[PDB]
Amino acid sequence: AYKLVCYFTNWSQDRQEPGKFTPENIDPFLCSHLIYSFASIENNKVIIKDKSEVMLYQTINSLKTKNPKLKILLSIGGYLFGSKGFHPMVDSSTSRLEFINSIILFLRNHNFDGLDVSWIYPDQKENTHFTVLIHELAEAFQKDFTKSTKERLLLTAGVSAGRQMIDNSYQVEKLAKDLDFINLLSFDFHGSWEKPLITGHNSPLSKGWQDRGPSSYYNVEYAVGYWIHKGMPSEKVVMGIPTYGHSFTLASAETTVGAPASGPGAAGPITESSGFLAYYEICQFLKGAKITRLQDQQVPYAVKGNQWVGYDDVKSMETKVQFLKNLNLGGAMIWSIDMDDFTGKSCNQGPYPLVQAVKRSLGS
Numbered sequence: 001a002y003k004l005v006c007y008f009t010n011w012s013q014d015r016q017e018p019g020k021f022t023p024e025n026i027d028p029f030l031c032s033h034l035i036y037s038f039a040s041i042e043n044n045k046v047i048i049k050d051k052s053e054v055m056l057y058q059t060i061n062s063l064k065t066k067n068p069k070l071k072i073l074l075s076i077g078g079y080l081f082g083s084k085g086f087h088p089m090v091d092s093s094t095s096r097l098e099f100i101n102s103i104i105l106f107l108r109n110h111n112f113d114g115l116d117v118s119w120i121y122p123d124q125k126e127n128t129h130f131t132v133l134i135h136e137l138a139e140a141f142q143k144d145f146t147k148s149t150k151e152r153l154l155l156t157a158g159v160s161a162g163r164q165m166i167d168n169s170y171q172v173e174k175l176a177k178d179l180d181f182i183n184l185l186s187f188d189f190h191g192s193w194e195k196p197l198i199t200g201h202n203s204p205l206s207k208g209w210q211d212r213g214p215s216s217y218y219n220v221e222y223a224v225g226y227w228i229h230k231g232m233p234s235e236k237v238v239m240g241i242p243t244y245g246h247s248f249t250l251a252s253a254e255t256t257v258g259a260p261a262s263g264p265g266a267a268g269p270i271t272e273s274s275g276f277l278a279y280y281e282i283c284q285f286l287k288g289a290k291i292t293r294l295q296d297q298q299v300p301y302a303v304k305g306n307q308w309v310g311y312d313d314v315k316s317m318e319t320k321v322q323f324l325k326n327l328n329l330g331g332a333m334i335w336s337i338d339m340d341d342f343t344g345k346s347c348n349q350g351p352y353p354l355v356q357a358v359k360r361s362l363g364s
């Protein structure tokens with residue numbers, strides 16, 4: 001059966017409506033797997049820094065009581081944690097063992113079903129440390145299993161969808177044996193970090209008709225194909241789908257993909273971060289905007305004034321699910337359900353319109 005793996009985040013709790021998210025906003029039957037982002041590491045041991053830590057625990061038990069099949073994982077890593085967050089824990093056998101033992105105890109004590117390691121990114125420098133850490137975790141989880149009456153703790157990893165970073169960071173065949181699945185981060189293909197700075201879509205399914213050479217790697221279709229080619233079984237690929245888009249401020253009258261941009265788009269009023277918008281912000285931006293669907297890339301962008309936003313909607317997600325089924329992938333992953341219109345109060349499409357569309361397509 002296809003998985004629907006849903007990340008939610010610690011920091012959405014600080015937002016104003018309609019972006020104010022706490023774990024009680026989670027629908028227990030919406031996803032097959034939930035992933036909390038992110039735990040940290042202190043004195044080589046896993047810890048959660050979250051004033052709402054006790055709420056998270058209560059909610060975990062409540063959700064799992066309501067849906068005995070639900071799996072809830074703890075993620076550590078992410079972009080801001082970077083590689084530095086894993087040091088000094090990773091630099092010795094004794095310090096990794098301390099971490100791993102703390103993980104098993106913590107996960108069991110708080111009713112989690114497994115660990116997601118989203119190291120952003122190992123790159124060439126930390127390839128070895130990451131490979132070793134994953135291997136030692138898998139082994140320890142297996143050893144824990146043989147001595148327990150409970151199910152084996154799951155181990156997953158959020159991984160790059162960029163060909164160069166994939167080649168640099170990962171020993172893929174080994175990863176295929178140690179991981180239950182990958183959460184393929186198939187988004188951020190384009191954004192305001194690029195040079196030269198031109199518009200491009202966050203998460204195009206396929207390449208543009210004019211894309212040749214390396215430009216042709218920056219899409220979901222290519223990333224999924226590449227991971228499988230490198231030795232990840234298709235059923236262990238859980239394909240990431242974003243509920244946010246990337247915005248640009250246009251530098252000229254041109255409004256097409258590849259148009260000149262002067263910088264990131266204006267910050268949204270709720271997420272307050274120049275360069276992206278959550279879906280509950282996008283649906284407001286679309287009012288008064290001009291929407292274009294790329295027939296080649298299979299996704300929409302919209303323009304209003306000097307703002308250009310590449311994003312995903314119900315339609316582009318239905319196409320992405322047809323793709324994942326056709327490639328026999330393990331399911332879909334969402335970054336992140338707290339940026340869908342979870343309350344339904346913004347987009348006039350009911351609660352969780354994007355994730356519900358995915359769930360529906362997966363089961364139809």
Ligand SMILES: CC(=O)N[C@@H]1[C@@H](O)[C@H](O[C@@H]2O[C@H](CO)[C@@H](O[C@@H]3O[C@H](CO)[C@@H](O[C@@H]4O[C@H](CO)[C@@H](O)[C@H](O)[C@H]4NC(C)=O)[C@H](O)[C@H]3NC(C)=O)[C@H](O)[C@H]2NC(C)=O)[C@@H](CO)O[C@H]1O
Nearest residue numbers: 078079080081118158160161162165185188189193244276
């Ligand atoms: C083709 C290619 O290789 N492109 C590179 C880009 O991928 C890269 O941008 C970074 O991409 C990573 C995924 O590879 C992304 O991190 C994951 O994705 C989400 C959404 O972007 C991140 O969410 C952010 O988390 C931080 C805390 O860590 C929050 O502060 C922030 O608000 C979140 N943003 C959003 C929109 O929700 C996650 O951290 C992470 N997910 C997991 C499971 O780990 C980075 O965010 C991307 N970096 C930036 C600056 O956007 C790009 C820059 O490195 O380089 C290209 O080459």
